[PDB]
């Protein structure tokens, strides 16, 4: 099913992921909101995953992170949304979602988080239920099996 441009693959409901999707159209706010799966890749020589809910389609990507998730970036690397949002922008963290031609993928595309809102970053893509979004200082750190396309 296709919400707000985004092409969304829907798993059978029994599936854990299906129950971890809360992406919906939100009446009062008058827009679409988005669960994303954050996967933080720290600096190797162990992952931290977190799923945020009700992120506003009209928000830059850093804007809809989440305290805990920031905190956790702040420990893998180096406090109101205002600042948090501001400290990740001058940060050097690259952000990769994954890319598709039902089937999982290990092909990633880096995305230009500061030059677009989530809704635009997602418009003509595919997600499995809802975006997964990898975070790392370098590619080396992304999980093994995962390969980025430039």
């Amino acid at each position: 099913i296709i919400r707000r441009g985004v092409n969304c693959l829907m798993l059978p409901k029994g599936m854990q992921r299906s129950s971890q999707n809360r992406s919906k159209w939100d009446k009062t706010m008058d827009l679409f909101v988005w669960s994303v799966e954050w996967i933080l890749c720290p600096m190797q020589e162990e992952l931290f995953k977190h799923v945020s809910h009700r992120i506003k389609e009209t928000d830059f990507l850093v804007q809809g992170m989440g305290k805990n998730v920031f905190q956790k970036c702040c420990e893998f690397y180096r406090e109101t949304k205002e600042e948090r949002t501001q400290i990740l922008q001058k940060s050097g963290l690259k952000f990769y979602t994954k890319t598709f031609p039902i089937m999982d993928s290990k092909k990633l595309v880096e995305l230009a988080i500061h030059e677009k809102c989530i809704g635009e970053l997602l418009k003509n893509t595919t997600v499995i239920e809802f975006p997964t979004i990898f975070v790392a200082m370098t590619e080396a750190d992304l999980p093994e099996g995962y390969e980025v396309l430039h």
Binding site: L11, G14, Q16, R22, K49, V51, I102, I128
Partner: protein, 219 residues
């Protein structure tokens, strides 16, 4: 083979003590070969043990003597992959961790603090994997005792008795219990002996006397 698209349930970080000692991940998923459900334990993407479906005979959440941040999931089975093991699956979930993990999966909100919410969820995914996990300490009871020289926990459930968890782990279906005969050693402590319909005797010694009442009542 297994990923987010055929994974029924996935909990990282369980402390498997039988049929092996190791920190593992617990996973229910439907095989992409034939749509069939499977229980596996993973090390990253190793599979130390997989059970396919029938196969699981009995499974249950059990408390950990004297340790409430902790909980056993106990599962018995007719067979597994390569017959690598035979002994029952005992593992130990941490409560607090379980909650925070359910939270980091977005399965439960920041505020929720009742573990039985996790438990509800595990029991349900399990039914989706062709099997029941009972939860009889939410009328059951357990006590300490010894077999020969080894201490263990004797748990008394509605339809089973389990003696755990040093190898060999015993399970007795209640309907297989011909008799339990009692025997004093002190005013403070006694021995109980189970007798199976096929004549095997199992001498559960050194039970505290305060437990006597609960055992008679059970029969």
């Amino acid at each position: 083979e297994i990923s987010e698209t055929n994974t029924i349930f996935k909990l990282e970080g369980v402390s498997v003590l039988s049929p092996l000692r190791k920190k593992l991940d617990l996973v229910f998923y439907l095989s992409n070969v034939d749509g069939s459900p499977v229980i596996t334990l993973l090390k990253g993407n190793d599979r130390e043990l997989s059970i396919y479906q029938k196969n699981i005979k009995m499974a249950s959440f059990l408390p950990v003597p004297e340790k409430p941040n902790l909980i056993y999931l106990f599962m018995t089975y007719t067979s597994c992959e390569d017959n690598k093991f035979s002994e029952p699956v005992v593992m130990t979930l941490n409560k607090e961790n379980t909650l925070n993990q359910f939270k980091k999966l977005g399965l439960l909100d920041s505020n929720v603090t009742d573990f039985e919410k996790c438990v509800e969820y595990i029991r349900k995914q399990a039914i989706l994997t062709g099997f029941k996990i009972s939860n009889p300490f939410v009328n059951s009871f357990h006590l300490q005792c010894h077999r020969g020289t080894k201490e263990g926990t004797l748990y008394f459930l509605p339809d089973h008795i389990i003696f755990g968890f040093k190898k060999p782990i015993l399970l007795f279906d209640a309907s297989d219990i011909e008799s339990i005969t009692y025997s004093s050693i002190t005013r403070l402590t006694f021995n109980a002996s189970l007798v199976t319909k096929d004549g095997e005797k199992y001498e559960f010694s050194m039970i505290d006397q305060t437990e006597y009442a609960k055992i008679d009542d059970y029969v």
